[PDB]
């Protein structure tokens, strides 16, 4: 019912937004995309406007990728960032891309991923600095996947559990703090 | 004034175009009008649109910049590069990147260009096994904190550049020691 079809919609919304600019995407090219048709997207998340606040709700990306205790969670953040997804991905950096002159979308999306994933971060460090930490980690993080994905793409030199090998410590030295 | 600073100021204003605007919206005229100067200008010193593209996607100098000196605190010298609070679309080379799209003949030319100009040519210089993933995390590094810090936060990015050095330059060292 709505699981599947709403599944369908947030990911042709992601990929929409994240590939596209901002002022170009209709609901019916989402609609097309997603298989369904625009008056259940329009049903389910009420307009465009409110279509993007769900896909710059970053709280349930911080419940993935800063799960579990801080011991290990360097490797484990490098392992999901190292996986040779998308380009488009992740979405959080690529919709922010797509903005451009549409000013009202990207200050929301900036707002909220601080919020929502740098502070996240931020409240678990030990230590003095831990805002400034958390910022440099994500900066690790998404600087890898968009230049694996994006950049590179086929030219990318390594395995995931090469990149994890050389990266995790260094990531894992700012979660530590010192 | 001279020729040289009407170049500048067609390269900065050119830069800035491929960095922010869907290649298929710009326009020589925009350019120009941009940087103040005529369009005729450019097609003097760059020939067309596509060579001005060419040239700015040619990494070399930004190359012969971020890697100068000895690797003996490369890393300090790099995050302090990378570090500064410049323009949202700076790097250009990611910028430009992500105004391309579906693997158009522009962004292969981008993307193979910086894994020669600037993967493979910080790799050369690297000691130690795994010279060319190596190189990648560190690209990674720097251009994750420039887009992070200049882009994404803005005003709300923490710290001032050297704090920044204190905590991110040691890890940028130890990929270029060793991994
Ligand atoms: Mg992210
Ligand atoms: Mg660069
Ligand atoms: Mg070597």
Same mark, same amino acid.
């Given at each position: 019912?709505?699981?599947?079809?709403?599944?369908?919609?947030?990911?042709?919304?992601?990929?929409?937004?994240?590939?596209?600019?901002?002022?170009?995407?209709?609901?019916?090219?989402?609609?097309?995309?997603?298989?369904?048709? +625009?008056?259940?997207?329009?049903?389910?998340?009420?307009?465009?406007?409110?279509?993007?606040?769900?896909?710059?709700?970053?709280?349930?990306? +911080?419940?993935?990728?800063?799960?579990?205790?801080?011991?290990?969670?360097?490797?484990?953040?490098?392992?999901?960032?190292?996986?040779?997804?998308?380009?488009?991905?992740?979405?959080?950096?690529?919709?922010?891309?797509?903005?451009?002159?549409?000013?009202?979308?990207?200050?929301?999306?900036? +707002?909220?991923?601080?919020?929502?994933?740098?502070?996240?971060?931020?409240?678990?460090?030990?230590?003095?600095?831990?805002?400034?930490?958390?910022?440099?980690?994500?900066?690790?993080?998404?600087?890898?996947?968009?230049?694996?994905?994006?950049?590179?793409?086929? /030219?990318?030199?390594?395995?995931?559990?090469?990149?994890?090998? /050389?990266?995790?410590?260094?990531?894992?030295?700012?979660?530590?703090?010192?």
């Amino acid at each position: 019912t709505a699981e599947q079809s709403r599944s369908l919609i947030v990911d042709a919304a992601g990929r929409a937004f994240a590939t596209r600019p901002y002022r170009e995407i209709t609901l019916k090219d989402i609609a097309e995309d997603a298989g369904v048709s +625009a008056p259940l997207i329009i049903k389910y998340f009420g307009s465009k406007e409110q279509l993007f606040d769900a896909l710059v709700d970053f709280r349930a990306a +911080a419940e993935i990728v800063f799960s579990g205790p801080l011991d290990g969670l360097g490797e484990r953040m490098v392992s999901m960032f190292a996986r040779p997804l998308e380009p488009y991905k992740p979405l959080s950096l690529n919709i922010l891309f797509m903005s451009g002159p549409s000013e009202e979308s990207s200050r929301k999306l900036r +707002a909220n991923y601080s919020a929502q994933m740098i502070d996240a971060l931020a409240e678990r460090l030990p230590g003095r600095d831990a805002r400034l930490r958390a910022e440099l980690v994500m900066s690790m993080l998404t600087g890898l996947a968009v230049m694996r994905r994006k950049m590179m793409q086929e /030219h990318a030199t390594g395995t995931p559990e090469e990149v994890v090998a /050389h990266y995790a410590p260094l990531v894992q030295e700012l979660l530590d703090g010192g």
